[PDB]
């Protein structure tokens, strides 16, 4: 019952955590994000749609300015997952964040 299909997961695993980095994303990062959203009492089923990801991001965003490492990691992971559901061929988290910021 993964959030992604096998094709979108094969996109996801290619994306790298930092723009110049060697480290790829992994499935466990989606698992951790889904396990972390229930701490904030956010509905984890919204991770399954691009609209749900946009809604979670819109709810997490005002807490970023003072947000802990865990909140920033969750926000960036859900931004990348939003880009994967939009099937935008982003290569890194900074690309994903710029893609989302362009919508504002």
């Amino acid at each position: 019952a993964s959030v992604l299909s096998g094709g979108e997961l094969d996109k996801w695993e290619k994306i790298r955590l930092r723009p110049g980095g060697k480290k790829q994303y992994k499935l466990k990062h989606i698992v951790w994000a889904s396990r972390e959203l229930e701490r904030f009492a956010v509905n984890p089923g919204l991770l399954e749609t691009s609209e749900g990801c946009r809604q979670i991001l819109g709810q997490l965003q005002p807490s970023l300015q003072t947000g802990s490492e865990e909140l920033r990691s969750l926000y960036n992971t859900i931004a990348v997952l939003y880009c994967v559901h939009q099937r935008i061929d982003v290569k890194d988290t900074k690309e994903a964040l710029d893609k989302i910021e362009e919508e504002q």
């Binding site: 951790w32 920033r72 969750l74």
Partner: peptide
């Protein structure tokens, strides 16, 4: 833990 080094 499991969190990524995203930031």
């Amino acid at each position: 833990k499991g969190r990524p080094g995203n930031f």
